[PDB]
Design an enzyme around this catalytic site. Structure first.
Site, PDB file in Angstrom:
ATOM      1  N   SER A  13       0.783  -1.235   0.000  1.00 53.37           N
ATOM      2  CA  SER A  13       0.000   0.000   0.000  1.00 53.37           C
ATOM      3  C   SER A  13       0.813   1.283   0.000  1.00 53.37           C
ATOM      4  CB  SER A  13      -0.962   0.026   1.193  1.00 53.37           C
ATOM      5  OG  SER A  13      -0.284   0.331   2.398  1.00 53.37           O
ATOM      6  N   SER A  15       0.384   3.630   2.257  1.00 53.49           N
ATOM      7  CA  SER A  15       0.288   4.217   3.591  1.00 53.49           C
ATOM      8  C   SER A  15       1.620   4.757   4.116  1.00 53.49           C
ATOM      9  CB  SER A  15      -0.301   3.214   4.601  1.00 53.49           C
ATOM     10  OG  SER A  15       0.633   2.220   4.984  1.00 53.49           O
ATOM     11  N   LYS A  70       4.348   0.112   9.288  1.00 53.68           N
ATOM     12  CA  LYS A  70       4.089   1.465   9.750  1.00 53.68           C
ATOM     13  C   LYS A  70       5.347   1.970  10.431  1.00 53.68           C
ATOM     14  CE  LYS A  70      -0.225   1.172   8.587  1.00 53.68           C
ATOM     15  NZ  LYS A  70      -0.858   1.995   7.544  1.00 53.68           N
ATOM     16  N   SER A 198      -3.749   6.189   5.853  1.00 51.33           N
ATOM     17  CA  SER A 198      -3.183   5.138   6.685  1.00 51.33           C
ATOM     18  C   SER A 198      -4.091   4.650   7.809  1.00 51.33           C
ATOM     19  CB  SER A 198      -1.866   5.629   7.280  1.00 51.33           C
ATOM     20  OG  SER A 198      -1.351   4.705   8.218  1.00 51.33           O
TER      21      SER A 198
END
EC number: 3.4.21.89
Length: 234
Positions: A13, A15, A70, A198
């Site tokens: 992704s 994010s 993350k 996100s």
């Protein structure tokens, strides 16, 4: 007498834009490493821990069958507060029951534009595209960029100028105001660099240490055939 385990990881992704992009293939160093003592040839199992600002691969707590990536923004004990208007973080260490210097550079236009489909006249994200700063895309919004310094670590974040988090959708911690969280012992608060794109700790809570896989060490390859992105994480 120490050894580390490394495993490739595909970036699915956006994010983590602009730091990590869809198509990036990174190297991840596992926190759990082997310690072969001296006298004996055993292999002790020691586990490392993420530092603030580390980019971390972990197992989604609600569904550990999937791996997410993350940035570890909050450490155990950290009092984390997010201002959805300014889109800035405030981090106070050791407040499980002194303000950390978090600074932001000036907002500047980024290299990316986020587009959105328009079925029924509504809007739904339809992708990110690198667009020369002097160009535009119909039904797209130029994303803003700035630098976030979390104590000693500085990195970039992207923001969607037309968006704002709906605080009411946040994971709300018992006894806490919305938008404020106290990171539990042995757990972490995760946030992606593409801040308005996100689904992170703001919405699903903390990540238990045991769910941690490893720390991102490099971009081994990327296929948006971007040899230019191979190297360190910036």
């Amino acid at each position: 007498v120490r050894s580390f385990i490394y495993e490739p990881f595909q970036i699915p992704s956006g994010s983590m834009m602009p730091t990590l992009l869809i198509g990036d293939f990174i190297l991840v160093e596992k926190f759990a490493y082997g310690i072969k003592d001296p006298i004996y040839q055993k292999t002790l199992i020691e586990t490392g821990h993420p530092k603030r600002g580390d980019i971390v691969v972990f197992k989604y707590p609600e569904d550990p069958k999937l791996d997410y990536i993350k940035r570890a923004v909050g450490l155990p004990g950290d009092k984390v507060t997010y201002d959805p208007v300014s889109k800035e973080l405030t981090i106070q260490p050791g407040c499980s029951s002194n303000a950390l210097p978090v600074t932001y550079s000036n907002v500047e236009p980024s290299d990316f534009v986020q587009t959105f489909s328009r079925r029924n006249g509504g809007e739904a994200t339809s992708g990110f595209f690198e667009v020369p700063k002097n160009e535009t895309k119909e039904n797209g919004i130029r994303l803003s960029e700035r630098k976030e310094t979390l104590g000693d670590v500085t990195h970039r974040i992207l923001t969607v100028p037309i968006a704002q988090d709906q605080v009411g959708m946040y994971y709300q911690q018992p006894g806490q105001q919305l938008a404020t969280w106290i990171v539990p012992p042995g757990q972490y608060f995760m946030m992606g660099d593409n801040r308005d794109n996100s689904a992170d700790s703001r919405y699903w809570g903390f990540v238990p240490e045991a769910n941690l896989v490893g720390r991102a060490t490099a971009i081994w390859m990327s296929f948006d055939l971007r040899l230019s992105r191979i190297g360190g994480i910036h």
